[PDB]
């Protein structure tokens, strides 16, 4: 009926890691190639994502344990899960008012129609937005959102991982933190942990569908040339 | 004392190819990542160059003969000479007033100090600007500038070319055009052809020095990640 020290440390270090790698003002967006409304929105969103991957790496490096994984396991987890952490962290910009990610005025406000113009069909954006509205309804504490991102990153069931026992043991520790945090700190949250676990399985299904459509994109040089070197590294399939 | 038809055709098709691939208003620059004044200017200029490579390819494809070279010879000539055609085509934006490429207001006006902030030392920018002021002094006709770009592109003495006899025979035809064009159409231009040929050898020396500094850049992932997929393809060394 109380969290440990090592418990509250994990929350502290994760929560601080998030604050350091997520700007609520979205003030660096002016440095991206501007949005345009073919695939008119591909340049701006490619930069959006690449900037985001840089942040997800910063968060990752401060998850306790992650640093001590092999460089190969870190890459494997980042490559397979980056799109999921991005979908996750974007919930903090998603507006139930608008059904759009509102990172600014009319420019950095992202309709579903914008992401079509980056080469994504509704068979992805439809469940993407259901995921987002569901995740928003859960009204997560910062402590939970941050923990959900870390648990998603430390999944052992990802292609290429080599030390699946050490990884799973890290994921386990974090799940124990979220269960305990909710038990003690979140009133009325007796079904929450289980709903949060459900959000992960939705992410895998988003991940899959997104990986399909990225491939179709990445195979067309006129479209892949609009991507960044980091995006092709992380979403590409070089393998180690 | 008169140009041929096939002569004047070569000039016509080259001159039109240039008009189609060079905007004197520099109005697409707003789509680049903005300039910033480490290497603060690397993102904007990387996009400048990548946009430019796209144009140099468009010009190239309309040089008579080029289309019929093998895909491998086209790539070899583009990869080895792209930086030279860019240095060449930039003369049309270079201002003797300012010693800068003035593509716009204070943003797209490029001091030598801007290009330092993209990771280039003076051992390159110094002769680069001497080249530019010299080339500007030559007060080239559109017909000559366009021909000089084509002759530079069709050099047989570039790494990777396979049909150096067919290429050289194309370069020869174009030199004959420039010699004749100047003979007939450019008054007082009896030393011009030879000065233009001199500008090519300066380009090789720029090319070399630039290739050195690009390598140092391209070998640092934090800097190469700011480049575009087209830039790394063209300036990289994949070889066929």
């Amino acid at each position: 009926h109380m969290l440990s020290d090592e418990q509250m440390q994990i929350i502290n270090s994760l929560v601080e890691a998030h604050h350091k790698t997520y700007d609520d003002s979205y003030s660096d967006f002016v440095r991206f190639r501007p949005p345009v409304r073919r695939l008119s929105m591909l340049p701006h969103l490619a930069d959006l994502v690449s900037y985001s991957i840089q942040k997800v790496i910063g968060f990752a490096k401060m998850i306790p344990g992650f640093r001590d994984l092999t460089a190969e396991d870190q890459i494997a987890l980042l490559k397979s899960s980056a799109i999921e952490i991005i979908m996750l962290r974007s919930n903090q910009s998603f507006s139930l008012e608008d059904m759009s990610w509102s990172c600014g005025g009319p420019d950095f406000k992202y309709c579903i129609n914008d992401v079509t113009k980056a080469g994504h069909t509704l068979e992805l954006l439809e469940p993407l937005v259901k995921f987002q509205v569901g995740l928003k309804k859960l009204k997560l504490h910062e402590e939970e959102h941050v923990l959900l991102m870390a648990i998603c990153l430390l999944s052992p069931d990802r292609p290429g991982v080599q030390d699946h026992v050490r990884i799973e043991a890290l994921q386990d520790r974090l799940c124990d933190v979220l269960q305990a945090y909710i038990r003690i700190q979140h009133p009325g949250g007796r079904l929450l942990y289980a709903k949060m676990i459900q959000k992960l399985a939705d992410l895998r299904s988003l991940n899959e569908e997104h990986s399909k459509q990225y491939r179709s994109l990445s195979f067309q040089p006129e479209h892949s040339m609009q991507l960044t070197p980091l995006v092709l590294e992380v979403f590409g399939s070089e393998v180690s | 004392h008169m140009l041929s038809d096939e002569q004047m055709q070569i000039i016509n098709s080259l001159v039109e190819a240039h008009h189609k691939t060079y905007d004197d208003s520099y109005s697409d620059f707003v789509r680049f990542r903005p300039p910033v004044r480490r290497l603060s200017m690397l993102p904007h200029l990387a996009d400048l160059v990548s946009y430019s490579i796209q144009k140099v390819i468009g010009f190239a494809k309309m040089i008579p003969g080029f289309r019929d070279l093998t895909a491998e010879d086209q790539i070899a000539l583009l990869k080895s000479s792209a930086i030279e055609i860019i240095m060449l085509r930039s003369n049309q934006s270079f201002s003797l007033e300012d010693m800068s490429w003035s593509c716009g207001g204070p943003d797209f006006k490029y001091c030598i100090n801007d290009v330092t902030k993209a990771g280039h030392t003076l051992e390159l920018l110094e002769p680069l600007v001497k080249f530019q002021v010299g080339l500007k002094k030559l007060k080239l006709h559109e017909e000559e500038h366009v021909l000089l770009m084509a002759i530079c592109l069709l050099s047989p003495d570039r790494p990777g070319v396979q049909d150096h006899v067919r290429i050289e025979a194309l370069q020869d035809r174009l030199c004959d055009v420039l010699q004749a064009y100047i003979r007939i159409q450019h008054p007082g231009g009896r030393l011009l052809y030879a000065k233009m040929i001199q500008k090519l050898a300066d380009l090789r020396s720029l090319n070399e020095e630039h290739s050195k500094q690009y390598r140092s850049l391209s070998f640092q992932p934090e800097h190469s990640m700011q480049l575009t997929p087209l830039v790394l393809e063209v300036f990289g060394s994949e070889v066929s």
Binding site: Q54, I57, K61, A71, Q74, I75, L78, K79, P229, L230, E233, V234, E238, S240 | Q220, P221, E222, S224, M225
Partner: peptide
């Protein structure tokens, strides 16, 4: 070969 990831990591 994840040259950038390694660097970033």
């Amino acid at each position: 070969k994840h040259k950038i990831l390694h660097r970033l990591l």
